[PDB]
């Protein structure tokens, strides 16, 4: 059963690594969403400043 123990430990390690990679992908997605929100905010600010310069 040493082989079975090694297989179980390898499966646990692979699952942990997969969850870690998923968490990192969530990091990237959340950062991208924050960047998109910041881009929308800066676009709104630029539009407001352009209209202020127009008048």
């Amino acid at each position: 059963d040493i082989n079975n123990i090694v297989k179980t430990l390898h499966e646990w390690c692979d699952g942990c690594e997969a969850v870690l990679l998923g968490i990192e992908q969530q990091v990237l997605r959340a950062n991208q969403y924050k960047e998109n929100h910041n881009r929308t905010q800066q676009q709104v600010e630029a539009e407001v400043t352009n209209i202020k310069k127009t008048l």
Partner: protein, 98 residues
């Protein structure tokens, strides 16, 4: 920050698992052929890794998920209706009078 905290916790557990696996491999190669109660309990815990849930536990988990998901839907509805109220207030100034 929330999932970074969970990431750190999972990293700690993964490091512990890596240490256990390395010890098992070393024992298979050299070290103590059988460290007695230690490898016994390690194998027992690896045999309790499946855990095995019953219909009731899965039902309760789905129940909590559905409840808090309905709460999330209510929160999204509140945010959407606030956005709608802001849009209506702006529209009533854009063209509408009174």
């Amino acid at each position: 920050e929330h999932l970074i905290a969970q990431h750190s916790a999972i990293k700690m557990l993964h490091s512990r698992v890596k240490l256990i696996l390395e010890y098992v491999k070393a024992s298979e190669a050299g070290e103590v052929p059988f460290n007695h109660e230690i490898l016994r309990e390690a194998y027992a815990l690896c045999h309790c890794l499946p855990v095995l849930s019953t219909d009731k536990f899965k039902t309760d988990f789905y129940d909590q998920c559905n409840d808090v998901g309905l709460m999330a839907y209510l929160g999204t509805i509140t945010k959407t209706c606030n956005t709608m109220n802001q849009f209506v207030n702006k529209f009533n100034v854009l063209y509408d009078r009174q």
